[PDB]
DNA sequence: ATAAAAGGAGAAGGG
DNA sequence: CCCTTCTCCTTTTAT
């Protein structure tokens, strides 16, 4: 199965949900969610995983915070903003 | 200042 | 094992 950090990174490279998520500094690998349209992207995440309950941003954010220990994705000091690691980017 | 929202995390449960 | 789900508390942001 696909991993969350790859689901997001795939969307940014595809632009398939430009209204829900966009780059902030492509070079630094920072990105940000749309306050109004993030739930739609969260919805698409739970479905792709076939989860029991419909996915919400809070549950997805909880999952993202776990990447803080392994380093794939760290939270940035800007609203709804995260950052990929150089390894994840290449 | 205050509601609302974003952020946080321990625990237990599910593919 | 990679999240998922629930629950409760805190900080930040929007009103």
Swiss-Prot record:
Coiled coil: none annotated. It comes from the Eukaryota. It is found in: Nucleus. Changing residue 43 to P: In AGM10; very low protein expression, if any, in peripheral blood mononuclear cells; when tested in transfected cells, decreased transcription activation; in vitro, fails to bind PU motif-containing DNA probes; does not affect interaction with IRF4 and IRF8, nor nuclear localization. Induction: Highly expressed in both FV-P and FV-A-induced erythro-leukemia cell lines that have undergone rearrangements of the SPI1 gene due to the insertion of SFFV. Negatively regulated by microRNA-155 (miR-155). DNA binds at residues 49, 62, 65, 75. Residues 2-85 bind DNA. In the bone marrow, concentrated in hematopoietic stem cell, lymphoid progenitor, myeloid lineage (granulocyte macrophage progenitors, classical dendritic cells, monocytes) and B-cell clusters. Among B-cells, predominantly expressed in pre-B1 cells. Expressed in germinal center B-cells. Transmembrane segments: none annotated. Belongs to the ETS family. Binds DNA as a monomer. Can form homomers. Directly interacts with CEBPD/NF-IL6-beta; this interaction does not affect DNA-binding properties of each partner. Interacts with NONO/p54(nrb). Interacts with RUNX1/AML1. Interacts with GFI1; the interaction represses SPI1 transcriptional activity, hence blocks SPI1-induced macrophage differentiation of myeloid progenitor cells. Interacts with CEBPE. Interacts with IRF4/Pip and IRF8. Interacts with JUN. Interacts with RB1. Interacts with TBP. Pioneer transcription factor, which controls hematopoietic cell fate by decompacting stem cell heterochromatin and allowing other transcription factors to enter otherwise inaccessible genomic sites. Once in open chromatin, can directly control gene expression by binding genetic regulatory elements and can also more broadly influence transcription by recruiting transcription factors, such as interferon regulatory factors (IRFs), to otherwise inaccessible genomic regions. Transcriptionally activates genes important for myeloid and lymphoid lineages, such as CSF1R. It is linked to Agammaglobulinemia 10, autosomal dominant: A form of agammaglobulinemia, a primary immunodeficiency characterized by profoundly low or absent serum antibodies and low or absent circulating B-cells due to an early block of B-cell development. Affected individuals develop severe infections in the first years of life. This is Transcription factor PU.1. The lineage of its organism: Eukaryota, Metazoa, Chordata, Craniata, Vertebrata.
